[PDB]
Structures are given as structure tokens and as C-alpha cells.
């Protein structure tokens, strides 16, 4: 890792992919690490999720420019929560183009939040100067609109919050979750990206495809015992 | 370190940059060392901060002309306090051009002090006959208008009074400080100039990037202890 600041560190996964961790103290939850990705191709960058606010977003974007020598032109949020679009306000003024699940866009509009401008209902390939970022909506999970982003040339999947890290033992915040569709969505995620070398969750350390089974055990054990 | 007078000493940091220490007895504070920098390129010089009064500023300008064989043409103050612009009246009758944060100019007019002529709002590169002097405003700290000056070709950062030296243990004069912004401004300075070799504070010895972490520690411990 490389600590760019007091609350943000970055890890390179591949020559074009970096994963960041942004830390924020949130009342009722504590010190929460929120993860995103930085994808770079030919001096252009895509941000997958923003840190919780514009301030941390602006610091992260300034680092990509100055230390990674790329300009952020594209953004995709995993779902409508703050650890995904908390800093979208800052990117929109800057002219960054955003793509997201039409369900995320409808939720943001309803709630008074910044709204991504390009929507998709099932899948969409976004090109970062030829490098493909493949966005899929495979069903509900941690949030009803949560998506995944597959980077076929790198074999990296950003699973987002529908996946729990290996140190996590609880289902967590399920106030916008579709608990009954969650296990099914994970099974579709498992069948569709068997070759992922790295799988990055919404919070916690990245890992490999075991994070999918690990999450499925947590969701299923909870469904079994609360039922 | 070489004394050019009983109360002024100079240290050469590179073939183009010198930092000076000017000592003055300030009633109620005692014998205070105030630092500034002299940057020279092709017989032209820029002064970053002046001594506390006109007589010491004159002694220093004479030394640059007679020993450095350079003409002082440019001036940039770190903020509006006397240890930054105390000798500006002398420089202005001499035709030196001044560049400063627009907030410093606004404060100078309001406080009946000499007023710099060129203002900038977020950043400005002043070219000293070809050599760039990069000025930035990254938020409030010791003063609400304090800036930093970055010399990319020498990897030297003049941080000014928003930084405390390594022998300093107290937050000092916070009468015009923005204590809540200070720790965040420091993280921004740190993130932007990771290649800084020398870091010069407004008072005390210069050192490296540890001055930034040490000042952030002093500020954070004061906020924590006084809430
Ligand atoms: Na995130
Ligand atoms: Na000074
Ligand atoms: Zn969420
Ligand atoms: Zn989350
Ligand atoms: Zn001051
Ligand atoms: Zn000072």
C-alpha cells in the first residue's frame, strides 16, 4: 500500500488497476473503511465508487492526476449509498461522466442525492479509451441496485458491498438489502466470473473468489437461523 | 550558516536558494527568529517574507545586491503578520513587484498595512526570469490566508508559519489561526509535495517532511486536549 493521506491508502493490483481504502468515522458504525478502484488507460482514469465525501474525493482525484499522471474522465458507483456516491457532487462539476444502474439513478433522484447521467438496466460496457469496464446488474443483494464491474483484460472483479471480506462474520447493514435474492445473485456472480484473480469487496481486504462462498455462508446462515 | 550582520544569518540550501534567519526582540514575545528565503536566477532575486521591519529588510536587500550581485525584483509574503510583510514598505518604494494570496491583500487593506499589488486565489506560478516559484493556497492554518511556496527545480518547500520546527512543542500564537482547518491543510501539503527535500518553517530550523507530521501532531493534540 501507499498512504496518500491520513485517511486514504492505495494498493496497485495490476499495471492498470489500483484499489483504494478511504476511512471515515460514521456515528453509529465507528471507523469504516470504504473501498473503490482506480483504473487507468492511456492517461485516462475511471473511478469505481467515491470516498464518503467531496473532500476525500478531491484529495484522491488530485493524487491520480499528480502521482498517476492521469485525468479522471469516467465514474461508476456500485449502488446509491454514501460509500459509493458520497463525492459524486465534486466529480459532476468537474465534467466527469457517470454511468450506473438505472435503479441507482431512480433512487438518487427520489432521495435528493447527486444523479449519475447515463443509466443501464442489465449490462453495459464502458470503454476507457478501448479498455473495457463491464458493468452487470445480476439481481439484488446488499442493496437492491448493487452491480458488479468486471475488467476482462485484468481478471479483476469489483464486487462492491454485496460481498463481505474474509474477516467479516456478520451480514451487516441490511436496511436496503434484498436478503432473499442475495444468495441467488452470488451464485450468478460465482458462475459468471470464475477466472477473477482478485475480487474486491465494498469494505475490508480484497481476496479471490473465496469471498463469494464466504459471503454466501454468512447470508445463508442468517436466513436459516432467522427463519 | 553565515552571519552577514549581528541579527541576520544566511544558509545556502542550493546553488539558487538561500534561507535567512532574522532576529528581533518583540515586546511580549522576546527574541524571535523569523525566517525567509532568497531565490536567485540570472541576476534577479525573489524574497519570500521580509524581516520584521524596514531596517533589517534594507540590510538584507543590500547583501543580495553587493554579495549576490542580483537585483531583488519579486516578493511573496506567506501571510499578513509582521514577520512576513514587516519590511514591505521599503520594498515597494524600491519598485519590487509583490504577489500574494488575494486574502492577504484584502486583510492588509482592512488592517492598514502596506498592500501587495498582484493577488491570486488558488495558485499562481511566478517566473523569476524562467525559474518557477509555485504558490498555493491549500486552506487555513496558523493564519487564514497562509500559503506555501514550492520550487520544483530545487525540491524545496517554504511552508512558512503553518509549520512548527522540530524543537518547538506548542501551537504558539493562534490569535488569527483557523484551528479546525489546520490539520486538513497539513494533510493536503503533505500529499502534494512528496518529493520535498528541504522544508522551511516560519520560525526555527529547517528539516524535511517530518516538520509536517510533527506540526499535525501538535495541532491535533491541542484540539483533543481542549475539547
Ligand atoms: Na466504495
Ligand atoms: Na518570515
Ligand atoms: Zn451500501
Ligand atoms: Zn458498503
Ligand atoms: Zn504569523
Ligand atoms: Zn510567524
UniProtKB/Swiss-Prot annotation, chains A, B:
GO terms for cellular component: periplasmic space. Disulfide bonds: none annotated. One of its GO terms (molecular function) is beta-lactamase activity. One of its GO terms (biological process) is response to antibiotic. It is an enzyme of class 3 (hydrolase). Zn(2+) 2 binds at residues 83, 161, 203. Its cofactor is Zn(2+). Substrate binds at residues 164, 173. The keyword Oxidoreductase does not apply. It is found in: Periplasm. Binds 2 Zn(2+) ions per subunit. It can also bind Cd(2+) and Co(2+) to a lesser extent. CDD domains: CcrA-like_MBL-B1. NCBIfam families: bla_class_B_core, bla_subclass_B1, blaCcrA. Belongs to the metallo-beta-lactamase superfamily. Class-B beta-lactamase family. This is Metallo-beta-lactamase type 2. The gene is ccrA.
Amino acid at each position: 500500500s501507499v498512504k496518500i493521506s491520513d485517511d486514504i491508502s492505495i494498493t496497485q493490483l495490476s499495471d492498470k488497476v489500483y484499489t483504494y481504502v478511504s476511512l471515515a468515522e460514521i456515528e453509529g458504525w465507528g471507523m469504516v473503511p470504504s473501498n473503490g478502484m482506480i483504473v487507468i488507460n492511456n492517461h485516462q482514469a475511471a473511478l469505481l465508487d467515491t470516498p464518503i465525501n467531496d473532500a476525500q474525493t478531491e484529495m484522491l482525484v488530485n493524487w491520480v492526476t499528480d502521482s498517476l499522471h492521469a485525468k479522471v474522465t469516467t465514474f461508476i458507483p456500485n449502488h446509491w449509498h454514501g460509500d459509493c456516491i458520497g463525492g459524486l457532487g465534486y466529480l459532476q462539476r468537474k465534467g466527469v461522466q457517470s454511468y450506473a444502474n438505472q435503479m441507482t439513478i431512480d433512487l438518487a433522484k427520489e432521495k435528493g442525492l447527486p444523479v449519475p447521467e447515463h443509466g443501464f438496466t442489465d449490462s453495459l460496457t464502458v470503454s476507457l479509451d478501448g479498455m473495457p469496464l463491464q458493468c452487470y446488474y445480476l439481481g439484488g443483494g446488499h442493496a437492491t441496485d448493487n452491480i458488479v464491474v468486471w475488467l476482462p483484460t485484468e481478471n479483476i472483479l469489483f464486487g462492491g458491498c454485496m460481498l463481505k471480506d474474509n474477516q467479516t462474520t456478520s451480514i451487516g447493514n441490511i436496511s436496503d438489502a434484498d436478503v432473499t435474492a442475495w444468495p441467488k445473485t452470488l451464485d450468478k456472480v460465482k458462475a459468471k466470473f470464475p477466472s477473477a484473480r482478485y475480487v474486491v469487496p465494498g469494505h475490508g481486504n480484497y481476496g479471490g473468489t473465496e469471498l463469494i462462498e464466504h459471503t454466501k455462508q454468512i447470508v445463508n446462515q442468517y436466513i436459516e437461523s432467522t427463519s
